[PDB]
A paper describes a structure:
The apo structures of BACCAC_02680, BACCAC_02680E143Q, BACCAC_03717 and Amuc_0724 were obtained to 2.0, 2.1, 2.1 and 2.7 Å, respectively. BF4060 and BACCAC_02680E143Q have four fingers and BACCAC_03717 and Amuc_0724 have five out of six possible fingers that have been observed previously in other GH16 structures. In contrast, BACCAC_03717 and Amuc_0724 both possess a finger 2 (in addition to 1, 3, 5 and 6) and this has a more variable topology than the other fingers. For Amuc_0724, finger 2 sits over the top of finger 1, but in the BACCAC_03717 structure it points away from the cleft. This could reflect the flexibility of finger 2 in this enzyme and could potentially come down over loop 1 in solution like in the Amuc_0724 structure. The B-factor putty projections of the GH16 crystal structures show finger 2 is dynamic in the BACCAC_03717 and alternative conformations of individual fingers from of other GH16 family members has been observed previously, a finding which is indicative of flexibility. The structures for BACCAC_03717 and Amuc_0724 are more accommodating of milk oligosaccharides and have more open +1 subsites. BF4060, BACCAC_02680 and BACCAC_03717 also displayed some very weak activity against laminarin.
Numbering used by the authors: -6 to 241
The structure:
Amino acid sequence: RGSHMASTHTPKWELVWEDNFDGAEPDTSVWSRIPRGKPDWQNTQSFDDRCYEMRNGLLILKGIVNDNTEADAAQYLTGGLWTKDKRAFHGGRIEVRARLHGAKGAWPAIWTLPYETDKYSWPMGGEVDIMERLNHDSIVYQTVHSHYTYTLGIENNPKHGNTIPINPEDFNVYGVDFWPDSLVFHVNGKRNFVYPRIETEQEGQFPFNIPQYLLIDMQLGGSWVGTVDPADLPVEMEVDWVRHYQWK
C-alpha cells in the first residue's frame, strides 16, 4: 500500500480482536448481560449483580441459590454475557480461555448463534457449542445443532458432537475454526473433531458460514445435566480472555 507493496506473505492466523477483561466491568460496546428465557439454558439467566464479578483481570460468572419468594422466581440464578447486537464474528477461529469448578447440576457453556436474529431461526440458522461441561466431568462436549441434526434427526452422519478430556482444575482453551466446508473444534490446540459440509439430498446441513454472536454463561439444571445440589453452590466459571483470529 501507500509505502510498501501487496505486502506478499505466507497467510497465517492473525489476531483481529481480543478481550482480556481488563476493566471495572465487561466492555459495554461488546457485552450485555443475558436476560431470562424459557429454554433449560436460559431458565436461570439474571441481571442480579451477585452473578457477575471482575476479579484479578478475570471475568467471573456465578450460579447461586435464589432467595426470591415471588411465585414466578427461578430456584437458581446464573450470570451470562453475549455479544448480540454489539459484535459479530465472521467465521475465523474463536477461542476462550476459562477455568471451571465442579457442581452437581452446573453446565457452563461457550457457544455461538447467528448474529442476524431477524433473519435466522433456531435450529435452521445453526448453533455451535464451543464448550459444555456437565456436573464434575473431566471432559467437555463440543457440538453443532441444525435443521439437519435436530429437526430431521440426522445426528450421527456426520457425527454432530464429541467429548474430549480437560484439566478440570486448570484453565483450558476452547476453540472452533470456521471454514467454508467444515468446522474444526479444539481444546488446548488438540483437535476434538471436524463437522463436515457433506453432499446431501436434504437442506440445512451446513448453515454456519454466517456472522455469529458469542455467548458465555453459567447454567444450572435441565433434563441433560440432571438435578442441582444446592450444597455445591455458589459456583463460578472464570474467563481469562476471548481471542478471534482470521487466516490471512
